[PDB]
Amino acid sequence: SEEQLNRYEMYRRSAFPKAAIKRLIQSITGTSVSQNVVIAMSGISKVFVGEVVEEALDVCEKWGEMPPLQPKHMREAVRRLKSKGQIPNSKHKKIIFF
Amino acid sequence: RKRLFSKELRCMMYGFGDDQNPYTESVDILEDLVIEFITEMTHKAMSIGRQGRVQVEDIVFLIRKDPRKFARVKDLLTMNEELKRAR
């Protein structure tokens, strides 16, 4: 239609800027990264945003609300993703044997 | 901290079906997920392989967790060479 073509345009053309993530990663490493790191790390974070919004619209469709996304559907989105291990936290030393 | 992903993330939520005008407190949430996702995939990437940040260990975490992040990183590494072959 005429909205699906505009939505497909924003699904492809949108990206995080490489001039800021290379500034953001290098503040964590200390020295330097490469261009093929920033190209991949800018691409995984678009999949991760698409992992949340496609699942936060499943929270909103499950409850009785409309397309505008309140934060109620966004804290619930991170809760359901973390219970399936999708959201990694490297500060919780987990233990499976008890 | 200011918001470094305020205008970029509004295009992306529209790209996955949200609205043309998302709420400010919803982009407040998604901007903090991405900064933690890049932190909790760099803090764990500087212990694997070596104490640097080569991209041969960024591709390790994407398998056995979610195959969409792996099938969309093999496309960005293949298309880097088909966009330098055209020049």
Partner: peptide
Amino acid sequence: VNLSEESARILATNSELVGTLTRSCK
């Protein structure tokens, strides 16, 4: 020179269509 000016035109239309009014929520 063609790659330098056309890169910012994919993002310039990404500030005219999406996000016209800024909302909030209780």
